[PDB]
Design a protein around this ligand. Structure first.
Ligand SMILES: *[C@@H]1O[C@H](CO)[C@@H](O[C@@H]2O[C@H](CO)[C@@H](O[C@@H]3O[C@H](CO[C@H]4O[C@H](CO[C@H]5O[C@H](CO)[C@@H](O)[C@H](O)[C@@H]5O[C@H]5O[C@H](CO)[C@@H](O)[C@H](O)[C@@H]5O)[C@@H](O)[C@H](O[C@H]5O[C@H](CO)[C@@H](O)[C@H](O)[C@@H]5O[C@H]5O[C@H](CO)[C@@H](O)[C@H](O)[C@@H]5O)[C@@H]4O)[C@@H](O)[C@H](O[C@H]4O[C@H](CO)[C@@H](O)[C@H](O)[C@@H]4O[C@H]4O[C@H](CO)[C@@H](O)[C@H](O)[C@@H]4O[C@H]4O[C@H](CO)[C@@H](O)[C@H](O)[C@@H]4O)[C@@H]3O)[C@H](O)[C@H]2NC(C)=O)[C@H](O)[C@H]1NC(C)=O
Ligand SMILES: *[C@@H]1O[C@H](CO)[C@@H](O[C@@H]2O[C@H](CO)[C@@H](O[C@@H]3O[C@H](CO[C@H]4O[C@H](CO)[C@@H](O)[C@H](O)[C@@H]4O)[C@@H](O)[C@H](O[C@H]4O[C@H](CO)[C@@H](O)[C@H](O)[C@@H]4O[C@H]4O[C@H](CO)[C@@H](O)[C@H](O)[C@@H]4O)[C@@H]3O)[C@H](O)[C@H]2NC(C)=O)[C@H](O)[C@H]1NC(C)=O
Ligand SMILES: *[C@@H]1O[C@H](CO)[C@@H](O[C@@H]2O[C@H](CO)[C@@H](O[C@@H]3O[C@H](CO)[C@@H](O)[C@H](O)[C@@H]3O)[C@H](O)[C@H]2NC(C)=O)[C@H](O)[C@H]1NC(C)=O
Lengths: 51, 52, 111, 127
């Protein structure tokens, strides 16, 4: 997950075409990441080692 | 806009001079940019100057 | 600010009841299950007695039943006594990046 | 249990500025958010802004942008706030209050949960 709540900030750049960019970021800044289950990954390591 | 000692890898705010839809009315604009993506313009003391 | 609705001064005798509705807009109140009330007891600073819409912070009887109703937060009160006289606020999450509250309902308990 | 204290009363003319200070105890200063609220004589309370002891990032209510100001320090462990352009209305008492727990991996600043409250700050303004 990315907990920052990004928003779009749209500009018109060059004739008849539009650039998009990250806008003024709302809320408090937080750090993006991933999450995995420690018990099952360790068990899966335990099951892989025999192979 | 930098949490000077944060355990964080935030994105940077800079600006730039934008050529509007008409090619001879230039105008400034700004937008954020994720931190790896931009290279400093110079390896010198040009701590202001930045480029994609 | 968009102050929420609140029945201002409805009340009864001991053992009577009131009903509350905290209506905002379609964008603020019911987006998350995060609603809090604060009891401005007369003569002392406010006090914390609703959490998570349907939970009480500390050990207190769950008389003031919590319910989710989307655009408005509704709660039912019953089993009161004369000593329950106090002013009860209601607060809710209010979008980027703030909270909003109501006008406060006082239990003007009679007798 | 948490011990919380505010600065005392203050006197100005209407349209002036006010400053409020707060400092908690019972928990390490870097682990909780700090908020402020205004308590009228019966009108709905105004929530003004939230404060982060770690960062200089703060937000304020839709009434107060451009009007409020806030700073904080870590070593002494104090929270500060400043509002400009006071009114006869905001003779209402201001309350420092402790917010929710701080997390890096998910956001919790906007949680409207207040567990510890101060004893009030009464700014005075009159014609
Ligand atoms: C991915 O992944 C990731 C990972 O990496 C993740 O993340 C994650 O997530 C999760 C989920 O969300 C989360 O969780 C969270 O948490 C929080 C917190 O945490 C922890 O911690 C804590 C600590 O403490 C502190 O504070 C206090 C106060 O509060 C104080 O007193 C203390 O002292 C501390 O302080 C400081 O200082 C010190 C000094 O010494 C130091 O040392 C330290 O360190 C600090 O700093 C803890 O405590 C907790 O725990 C607790 O709680 C829980 C819950 O509740 C439980 O379960 C447990 O058990 C515990 O309990 C306690 O109490 C009891 C009573 O009875 C007892 O019995 C026991 O024994 C104990 O004592 C934790 O662990 C939290 O908070 C949260 O929760 C909340 O919210 C919920 C909803 O959501 C609810 O339900 C609950 O209930 C809660 O609420 C509560 O609380 C709050 C605060 O805390 C408040 O505000 C409210 O109002 C309430 O209140 C209550 O209580 C109180 C007391 O406390 C009272 O007073 C009142 O009256 C009432 O009653 C959650 O759980 C985590 O955090 C995270 N992590 C990180 C790292 O970030 C993620 O998520 C993923 N992803 C995604 C997407 O998600
Ligand atoms: C993550 O980041 C996103 C942004 O990317 C953010 O979403 C935005 O949230 C804000 C709230 O903070 C939203 O603001 C609302 O915008 C509407 C737009 O109104 C227009 O459009 C509607 C629908 O098309 C029309 O019906 C309307 O007439 C307008 O043309 C505003 O209407 C909202 O203002 C009202 O409600 C506010 C309270 O929510 C009041 O403060 C305000 O005064 C307005 O109330 C008045 O009007 C009401 C009727 O509308 C009336 O009943 C009341 O009595 C009062 O008189 C509000 O400003 C914004 O739209 C969101 N943007 C997008 C793209 O979704 C997320 O909130 C953010 N999430 C988190 C968790 O941070
Ligand atoms: C990213 O940086 C740029 C500047 O490099 C920021 O834009 C500028 O922000 C300042 C401060 O808010 C603006 O100045 C203010 O203008 C209002 C006008 O009402 C004035 O009342 C204030 O006292 C202050 O002077 C400035 O106008 C603005 N630049 C432009 C072209 O509008 C931008 O906000 C930064 N983004 C983030 C997310 O920090």
């Amino acid at each position: 997950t990315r907990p920052n709540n990004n928003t779009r900030k749209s500009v018109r750049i060059g004739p008849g075409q539009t650039f998009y960019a990250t806008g003024d970021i709302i809320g408090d800044i937080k750090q993006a990441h991933c999450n995995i289950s420690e018990e099952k990954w360790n068990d899966t390591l335990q099951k892989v080692g025999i192979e | 806009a930098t949490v000077k000692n944060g355990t964080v890898e935030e994105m940077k705010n800079c600006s730039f001079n934008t050529t509007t839809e008409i090619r001879d009315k230039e105008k400034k604009e700004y937008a954020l940019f994720y931190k790896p993506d931009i290279v400093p313009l110079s390896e010198t003391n040009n701590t202001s100057e930045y480029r994609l | 600010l968009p102050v929420l609705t609140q029945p201002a001064s409805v009340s009864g005798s001991p053992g009577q009841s009131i009903t509350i509705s905290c209506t905002g807009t379609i964008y603020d109140v019911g987006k998350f299950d995060l609603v809090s009330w604060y009891q401005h007891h007369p003569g002392k600073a406010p006090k914390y007695l609703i959490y998570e819409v349907k939970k009480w912070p500390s050990g207190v009887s769950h008389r003031f039943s919590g319910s989710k109703s989307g655009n408005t937060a509704s709660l039912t009160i019953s089993g009161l006594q004369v000593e329950d006289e106090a002013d009860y606020y209601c607060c809710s999450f209010g979008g980027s990046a703030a909270v909003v509250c109501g006008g406060g309902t006082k239990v003007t308990v009679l007798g | 249990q948490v011990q919380l204290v505010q600065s005392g009363a203050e006197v100005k003319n209407p349209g002036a500025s006010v400053k409020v200070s707060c400092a908690p105890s019972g928990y390490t200063f870097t682990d909780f958010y700090i908020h402020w609220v205004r308590l009228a004589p019966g009108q709905g309370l105004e929530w003004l802004g939230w404060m982060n002891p770690k960062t200089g990032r703060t937000n304020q209510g839709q009434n107060f942008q451009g009007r409020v100001t806030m700073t904080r320090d870590t070593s002494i462990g104090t929270a500060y706030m400043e509002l400009r352009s006071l009114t006869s209305d905001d003779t209402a008492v201001y309350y420092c209050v402790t917010g929710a727990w701080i997390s890096d991996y998910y956001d919790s600043s906007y949680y409207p949960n207040f567990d510890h409250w101060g004893q009030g700050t009464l700014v005075t303004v009159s014609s």
